Homo-oligomer: 247 residues x 3
């Protein structure tokens, strides 16, 4: 509009350089991000959830699947998808998309969750259908299947759409927290960082508990701060108690 | 300008949908927020303040107001208001507004603070006048009244303006920290998250202390990083030491 | 465009005011920030690094130069400079700049790092050249000189040009973490907050360790989430395993 333009400077004046044309994909990504960033007023909430019992449960279930030879591995991100899916039911406004002119809100009745997955071509986001209607075992098989397909790059565009919400877990690579960008036309995204044993006050003394840090970036046009806090809390509570497993 | 449009998707290829029009109030706020988001380069500072003594002082104070029947609950946010007000005097540049062209900064000598209150239609921000000249009892009394007014939706436009700074306390609902958006034409906003008992090093051992996490988002055109850190430290030091309060 | 204008309010209605015109510098940096904020999709990563051994080594080195009277104070930010420079080597894509149209990426082979320094007129960012080639003692002396120069306001043009990466350490003044704005045309910026002794699990008990909080904002058009995590982890690992030097 009436602002300063990009800073054009001769980099060779300082030393050797090398210029590279981005891939066509990297360009599309960059274009979507520039739009998302400018159009969506971002607010990020941070939180930590006690997954001590979730972890013991996950290992317990993997053992049971091992003795009867099921060839299925339950990763912790499966429980995160389920916790998110449950939360989208209780707070339907997070399961939505805002119109282009920002006038109308489309409330989605179906629950599909995109999960960021690392490929040699950087992160991509496959979408899992009806997370709310599928069990841990079935989702784990899907995640397993989609994983290798992801790392090979044999991915169809059709598999990468229909998302209502995104989960990005980068804790395996690091960070204690992060502030992600919302994936339009979705209205929110959950970030997951590395877990760690922490001293938690029980009322008389500190006790070691396995804490999982999470973050929630949301479109502030659609969601207000109070509703954001209620949402990340529900996810917290759900993850810190796996009685949701016994339907 | 020359960027991609909002994605168009036929959402019904996926399942049942329901399109709904936003409320009048909602379109206005989201329109304010879009402007605030792009015209204000945001920096967010995070911090934690030891409120162990403040909590004991607060429960002591209104158990005596109960003894004299003053009909007033002292909420924690009242103390945060005073701490912010005191910090605004010590660093006047935080109590200001940038002109549209960004050449002129208006330093305000008055101190009014907007505080976010939850209502049936979401958070609203009523403004409290001369926070630096009012006592804990008076502010708490206004707070009870104005919050009650806000929930019924009877708030007046005059009670919604004159703001110099904004406080948003959502810790009663959750989060350990958050990064809020500045409410133009203001310059800074303070967020308050949920408190927790945490192990704090005393020099020889860890001891349990009640820690309140706070956050400060500010207009980086007006405020640089060092002053932002100095500002949140003052708020921290004021809340962690009730002497500075009185 | 199709957006609200800046709010228009007469503030004298509410009480005493005083309008002040910004200095030229303040106007200039504010204009830069407004563009950077809008043109760069920001993502901020957070982390903590165990600097217990670094701090013990740093104090040993200072006490040595002290008795020899060599006039050199090693500050923690010098180690961070070395850690970042090293990371810039391992992950060259952070050592770069994106074109105005966002189609071309300029990979640099030189490593210059700007470090935020406080002055009577606020923070300024003088650039230190060839950090990957220079030692800790040498950088410490450079830092002392340029810092005194900045506080006196005698920094040349060239002394503040050529940066590839910015480090802003405000931990001496406060904060437990913060999310800074990328200094275009750079691609990332590292913030450093106040260190504190924290309990750390060793497998059977909590032991006290000195933890330094760091944060990383970056141009998400160039850097994705995974590589952002890898980058901040390298700096973390380098700072916690001082042996690596």
């Amino acid at each position: 509009p009436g602002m300063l333009p990009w800073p054009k400077v001769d980099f060779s004046k300082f030393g050797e350089i090398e210029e590279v044309e981005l891939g066509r994909i990297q360009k599309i990504s960059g274009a979507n991000l520039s739009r998302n960033w400018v159009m969506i007023p971002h607010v990020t909430h941070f939180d930590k959830t006690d997954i001590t019992e979730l972890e013991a449960f996950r290992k317990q279930q993997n053992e049971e699947a091992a003795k009867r030879k099921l060839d299925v591995k339950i990763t912790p991100v499966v429980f995160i998808m389920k916790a998110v899916a449950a939360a989208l039911e209780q707070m339907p406004r997070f399961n939505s998309s805002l119109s282009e002119d920002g006038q109308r809100l489309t409330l989605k009745k179906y629950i599909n969750i995109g999960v960021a997955v690392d490929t040699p071509n950087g992160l991509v986001v496959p979408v899992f259908k009806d997370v709310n209607k599928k069990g841990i075992i079935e989702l784990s098989r899907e995640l397993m299947t989609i994983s290798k397909k992801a790392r090979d790059g044999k991915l169809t565009a059709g598999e990468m759409q229909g998302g209502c919400f995104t989960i990005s877990s980068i804790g395996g690579l690091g960070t204690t927290h992060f502030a992600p960008i919302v994936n339009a036309p979705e209205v929110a995204i959950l970030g997951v960082s590395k877990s760690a044993m922490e001293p938690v006050w029980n009322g008389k003394e500190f006790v070691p508990r396995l804490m999982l840090p999470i973050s929630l970036s949301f479109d502030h046009r659609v969601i207000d701060g109070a509703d954001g806090a209620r949402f990340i809390t529900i996810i917290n509570n759900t993850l810190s108690d796996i009685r949701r497993l016994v339907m």
